[PDB]
Design a protein around this ligand. Structure first.
Ligand SMILES: Cn1c(=O)cc(CP(=O)(O)O)c2ccccc21
Ligand SMILES: [Zn+2]
Ligand SMILES: [Zn+2]
Length: 229
C-alpha cells in the first residue's frame, strides 16, 4: 500500500485521494513524519499541506507528475508551522496558486514561513467564506476554533468518507497532544469536537502525525484535551 518515492511515502486512500508523508529530523524528537493530501478532481490535482521542506515539496510535485500527470490547480495549507507550510516556495516556483487562513499568512513571516498567495476568511460558524476559496472542487474548508494553533484549519473531501484534521487531531491510541507550544489549551477540546460535527459522515480521519484512523481519533483527542482545562 505504501509507496516509497525518494525520501517520501505515498499511500492511496480512495480512488482520487492519496496521503503524502515527509520526514524531518527533530533534534530531541527523532525523524518526525508529517502527512498531507493529494486529490484528483477531474482534470486537475489539489494539494493539502506542503512537506517540511522545499526540496521534499518539489518531490511531491514530481510524484504527481509521474503518477497522475495532471496540473496542480491549487494548494491549501492548514497552519503556519514548518510541517504544513515549509515548502511554500516550491509551490510558488511551480506556478501553483496557494491558499491559507488569513491568520496563517499573517503569522508566516514570524514563524519563518513564506505566506501563501491568497487568504481564506471564515464565517462566525467556522465555514470558509466561499468567495475566498474559489475553484476548491470537493475540498470543504472549516475553521474549528483554536486548538493545536489559533490558526489551524481542517478540510473535508466531498464525495469521499475522508476528513483531514491536520495537527488538531491525534490517533485513537495517542498518548499526548504533541507540540502544544502554540496551542490554545482552553479551547482545544471544543475545537476537536467542532471538527467532528462539521464532517459527520467522515469515517476516515486523516491527520498530520499518524496513519488514518476511525472517528475514535476525534473522540479520543477531545477527551484528552478535556484534561488541559
Ligand atoms: C518541537 N516541535 C515544534 O516546535 C514544532 C513542530 C511541528 P507541529 O507538529 O506542527 O507542531 C513539532 C513537531 C513534532 C515534534 C516537535 C515539534
Ligand atoms: Zn503545528
Ligand atoms: Zn504537527
Amino acid at each position: 500500500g505504501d509507496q516509497r518515492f525518494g525520501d517520501l511515502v505515498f499511500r492511496q486512500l480512495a480512488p482520487n485521494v492519496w496521503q503524502h508523508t515527509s520526514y524531518l529530523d527533530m533534534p530531541g524528537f527523532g525523524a518526525v513524519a508529517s502527512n498531507g493530501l493529494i486529490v484528483r478532481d477531474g482534470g486537475r490535482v489539489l494539494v493539502v499541506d506542503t512537506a517540511w521542506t522545499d526540496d521534499q515539496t518539489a518531490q511531491i510535485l514530481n510524484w504527481i507528475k509521474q503518477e497522475i500527470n495532471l496540473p496542480v490547480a491549487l494548494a491549501v495549507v492548514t497552519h503556519a508551522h514548518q510541517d504544513k507550510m515549509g515548502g511554500m516556495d516550491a509551490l510558488h516556483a511551480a506556478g501553483i496558486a496557494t491558499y491559507a487562513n488569513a491568520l496563517s499568512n499573517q503569522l508566516a513571516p514570524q514563524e519563518g514561513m513564506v505566506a501563501a498567495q491568497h487568504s481564506l476568511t471564515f464565517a462566525a460558524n467556522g465555514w470558509v467564506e466561499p468567495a475566498t476559496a474559489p475553484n476548491f472542487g470537493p475540498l470543504k474548508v472549516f475553521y474549528p476554533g483554536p486548538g493545536h494553533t489559533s490558526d489551524n484549519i481542517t478540510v473535508g473531501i466531498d464525495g469521499t468518507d475522508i476528513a483531514f484534521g491536520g495537527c488538531l487531531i491525534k490517533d485513537s491510541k495517542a498518548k499526548s497532544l504533541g507540540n502544544l507550544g502554540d496551542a490554545d489549551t482552553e479551547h482545544y477540546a471544543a475545537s476537536a469536537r467542532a471538527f467532528g460535527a462539521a464532517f459527520p459522515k467522515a469515517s476516515m480521519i486523516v491527520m498530520s502525525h499518524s496513519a488514518p484512523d476511525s472517528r475514535a481519533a476525534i473522540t479520543h483527542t477531545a477527551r484528552m484535551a478535556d484534561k488541559l482545562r
